[PDB]
C-alpha cells in the first residue's frame, strides 16, 4: 500500500526528491479513525494522480519532528509541497495550510491536487480549491 516515512531525514528526502510532482503528506496515525477514511481516499486515487503527485504517510508519534512547527494537533492533517516549498490552498475553511478533515469524496481530492500542481508549477505559493468547504 501507500509508502510511509519513518524519521525526519526520510521526510526531508521525500520532499527534496521531486522536481516535478507535488509531494502530498498525510500526518497522523494509520490507526486513527479520521486517518483511515482519508488514507482510503489517498490509496484509491494514488494511481490516478501518479503523474503529477506522490503521497506519503507519516506517523506523528514515530516522527514527531514536525508536530510543533506544522501545528499537527488535528487527528488527521494533509499538506502539500512542491519543489521544497509548502503550498497553501484556500479551501474557504479559514486555514489555508492543511486539509484537516476526512474528505471522503475521492474526485474532490484529485482536483485539489491537480489545482495545487498547476498553481505551484506556475510559481504560485497560494492556490484556490474548486469546491468551497465553508
Amino acid at each position: 500500500m501507500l509508502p510511509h516515512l519513518h524519521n525526519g531525514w526520510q521526510v526531508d528526502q521525500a520532499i527534496l526528491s521531486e522536481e516535478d510532482r507535488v509531494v502530498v503528506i498525510r500526518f497522523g496515525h494509520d490507526w486513527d479513525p479520521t486517518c483511515m477514511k482519508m488514507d482510503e481516499v489517498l490509496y484509491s486515487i494514488a494511481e490516478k494522480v501518479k503523474n503529477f503527485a506522490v503521497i506519503y504517510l507519516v506517523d506523528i508519534t514515530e516522527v514527531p519532528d514536525f508536530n510543533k512547527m506544522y501545528e499537527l494537533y488535528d487527528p488527521c492533517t494533509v499538506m502539500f509541497f512542491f519543489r521544497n516549498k509548502h503550498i497553501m490552498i484556500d479551501l474557504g475553511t479559514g486555514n489555508n495550510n492543511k486539509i484537516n478533515w476526512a474528505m471522503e469524496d475521492k474526485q474532490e481530492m484529485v482536483d485539489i491536487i491537480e489545482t495545487v500542481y498547476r498553481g505551484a508549477r506556475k510559481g504560485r505559493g497560494l492556490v484556490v480549491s474548486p469546491k468551497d468547504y465553508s
Binding site: 525526519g8 526531508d12 520532499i15 519532528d65 512547527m69 509541497f81 521544497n84 509548502h86 486555514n95 489555508n96
Partner: peptide, 25 residues
Amino acid sequence: PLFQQRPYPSPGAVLRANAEASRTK
C-alpha cells in the same frame, strides 16, 4: 487580508530549526 496566514517552512528548515534549538539548550 491583514495578518494573513503564512506558509510553513520546508521540512529541511524545520529539522534545522529543531537542531539549532538543541544546540542552544
